[PDB]
Scaffold this active site. Structure first.
Site, PDB file in Angstrom:
ATOM      1  CE1 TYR A  24      -1.912   3.512   2.386  1.00 45.10           C
ATOM      2  CE2 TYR A  24      -3.655   2.679   0.962  1.00 45.10           C
ATOM      3  CZ  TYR A  24      -3.125   3.690   1.757  1.00 45.10           C
ATOM      4  OH  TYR A  24      -3.808   4.877   1.895  1.00 45.10           O
ATOM      5  CG  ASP A  39     -15.446  -0.397   2.864  1.00 44.57           C
ATOM      6  OD1 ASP A  39     -16.635  -0.419   2.480  1.00 44.57           O
ATOM      7  OD2 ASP A  39     -14.557  -1.120   2.355  1.00 44.57           O
ATOM      8  CD  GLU A  44      -5.087  -5.192  -3.190  1.00 45.13           C
ATOM      9  OE1 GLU A  44      -5.071  -4.571  -4.271  1.00 45.13           O
ATOM     10  OE2 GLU A  44      -5.676  -6.283  -3.035  1.00 45.13           O
ATOM     11  CG  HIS A  58     -12.706  -6.903  -4.088  1.00 43.15           C
ATOM     12  ND1 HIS A  58     -13.331  -6.123  -5.035  1.00 43.15           N
ATOM     13  CD2 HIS A  58     -12.602  -6.137  -2.978  1.00 43.15           C
ATOM     14  CE1 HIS A  58     -13.599  -4.938  -4.518  1.00 43.15           C
ATOM     15  NE2 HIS A  58     -13.167  -4.920  -3.271  1.00 43.15           N
ATOM     16  CG  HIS A 110     -13.637  -0.921  -2.105  1.00 44.61           C
ATOM     17  ND1 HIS A 110     -13.472  -1.289  -0.787  1.00 44.61           N
ATOM     18  CD2 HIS A 110     -12.769   0.092  -2.325  1.00 44.61           C
ATOM     19  CE1 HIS A 110     -12.536  -0.535  -0.235  1.00 44.61           C
ATOM     20  NE2 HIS A 110     -12.093   0.310  -1.148  1.00 44.61           N
TER      21      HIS A 110
HETATM   22  K   LIG Z   1     -20.429  -2.241  -3.574  1.00 43.05           K
HETATM   23 ZN   LIG Z   2     -14.882  -2.284   0.752  1.00 46.65          ZN
END
Ligand SMILES: [K+]
Ligand SMILES: [Zn+2]
Ligand SMILES: [K+]
Ligand SMILES: [K+]
Ligand code: NA
Ligand code: NA
Ligand SMILES: [Zn+2]
Lengths: 340, 341
Positions: free
Chosen positions: A19, A284, A117, A159, A197
């Site tokens: 990072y 988040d 990452e 992800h 995200h």
């Molecule tokens: K999302």
């Molecule tokens: Zn997230």
């Protein structure tokens, strides 16, 4: 609502994350589950059960077998190769590259990765299996007739694409949950990603399938990880044409705009006819999150949960993102409060 | 032959490289140029000249303008974004991803990168330009009438594609040199990549170009960087069909087998009708080099130079890879002796 939680999540305790050009301590550390677990119990959700044992049959319907075989032995091979650090990919099959699969560990880790990452460490595989088990059990509760359930998954999974790991994810837990509901009798299931995200892994998995509707609210990919997917123009392909709805939003987005995207996604999910909704929950989106730029307050999560629950269909909530401040627990508990 | 070398190569002095899961001092360090230069001088090739000033016209014919603009301002934007380390891409546009280009530094660096082990740092842009300049001046000597020339390029370039950097490369010097020869009159040019690794970037730039033939001998991508290109099946696309020949070879390949591939590539190059040949010279094929699995010895580099020079056409030798072993200079010098005859 019952809570499915596995202690083996601690088996995933990576020491490094790439990072800002440095290898710093992982944002996705074991203390996240500890904090969140404590808060849900505190909010009255003290009925925590460990997941039972499950095979690969469910997961083998959403993830490539080569990919799974790779994860199970990734670490061993990396160490066998003589590398000193954790397993991290540095070469990737990007634009205008061959579709062929390398044979060595160095080549394969890059082939099966979308984000550098994320490092594979000892025990990552076992941890990912336990987390997947928690998602499968939560689905069974829903399939059994329960109205709500919370799978405190760790590591997260939105992800993790069909054949690639990244963004701290290895096995797409929500995808496995949705697949579980289908094998239990459902015909149509929807996955709603509220994590900050974009759920690129999830989208990839169901992009060409018309049996699962994928809706995601997230930071504009134009300036937010994962960066290469999540545009509003992505609505599905072939058999999955029309079963993907992305809602990208800019920096500083408050519940005012966010709430509107949520309403719309729920309208499209109802029109789809989902028999249940698997919620990919990421906190988040919190105004204090260290790696996100949305501005949602702790109370908003109570509102969010209530709105989603008002869909009238069973809900399986699956943990995803949310880092930094200890409020992540508060915010996760607030969502379950709304749903209840 | 004349040697083109720029001191600004030292401006490229990255402090980190992601390898084996750690950040270590880059393997492509300044001392490589220092020992290569000294070796070629000791071998007689002591007519070293600094490159002249050059614009972006040539490079803009092989690299994407957006990608070049990204490189120029990359470091400033990264620092401005507040990152403590050097600029290193973590997210990449792999399988089944959107073709849209990100707007921020975090997304663009990934969009313009094919290998995370390469870090952008203060001076990279400037160093890459001086290295490109050396390639250009080298090509100019060939266009003038010289039989051969050596462009001591650093950083290297064969891993830089149309719009992506990686493998310690940012601007494809060989590609620029080839374009320059075409701009000076040639209609057909070839690029021969003998570096142990496949020159995925060079292939990328000329994959749909019929005026430049690309031949490459390298370790099988199935078990060697860059891993995702360099297969024999890749012969070209569209307007560039048939103008790409890859010679991947396995572990422990002796010069006995390597030379066979070199002979076939030269035969394909001759049939193409190349007016000149740019040689992407990497000496990491050396048996003592730690990163490769071929077994070439120092004398074999003399044979290599001889064979390529026997082609009968002018040669521009552009420096690429080669681990920093004590014999790195000796091997590069041996290739030049071979060319000299
Ligand atoms: K999302
Ligand atoms: Zn997230
Ligand atoms: K090569
Ligand atoms: K070797
Ligand atoms: Na879909
Ligand atoms: Na070509
Ligand atoms: Zn090399």
């Amino acid at each position: 609502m019952r809570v499915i939680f596995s202690e083996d999540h601690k088996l995933r305790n990576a020491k490094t994350e790439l990072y800002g050009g440095e290898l710093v301590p992982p944002f996705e550390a074991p203390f996240r589950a500890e904090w969140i677990l404590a808060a849900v119990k505190e909010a009255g959700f003290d009925d925590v059960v460990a997941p039972a044992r499950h095979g690969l049959e469910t997961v083998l319907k959403v993830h490539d077998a080569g990919y799974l075989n790779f994860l199970e032995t990734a670490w061993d091979r990396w160490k066998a190769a003589g590398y000193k650090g954790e397993a991290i990919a540095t070469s990737f099959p990007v634009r205008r590259t061959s579709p062929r699969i390398p044979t060595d560990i160095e080549g394969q880790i890059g082939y099966y990765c979308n984000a550098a990452e994320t490092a594979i460490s000892p025990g990552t595989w076992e941890a990912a299996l336990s987390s997947m088990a928690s998602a499968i059990d939560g689905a069974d509760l829903i399939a059994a007739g329960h109205k709500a359930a919370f799978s405190l998954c760790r590591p997260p999974g939105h992800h993790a694409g069909i054949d690639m790991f990244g963004g701290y994810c290895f096995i797409n837990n929500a995808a496995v949950a949705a697949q579980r509901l289908l094998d239990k009798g459902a015909k149509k299931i929807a996955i709603l990603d509220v994590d900050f995200h974009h759920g690129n892994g999830t989208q990839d998995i169901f992009y060409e399938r018309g049996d699962v509707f994928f809706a995601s609210l997230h930071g504009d990919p134009a300036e937010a990880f994962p960066h290469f997917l999540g545009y509003a123009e992505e609505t599905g392909k072939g058999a999955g044409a029309g079963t993907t709805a992305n809602y990208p939003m800019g920096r500083g987005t408050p519940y005012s705009v966010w709430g509107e995207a949520l309403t719309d996604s729920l309208k499209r999910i109802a029109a789809f006819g989902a028999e249940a909704i698997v919620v990919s929950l990421g906190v988040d989106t919190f105004e204090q999150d260290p790696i996100s730029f949305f501005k949602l307050t702790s109370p908003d999560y109570i509102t969010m949960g209530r709105t989603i629950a008002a869909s009238g269909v069973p809900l399986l909530v699956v943990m995803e993102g949310g880092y930094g401040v200890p409020e992540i627990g508060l915010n996760v508990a607030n969502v379950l409060k709304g749903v209840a």
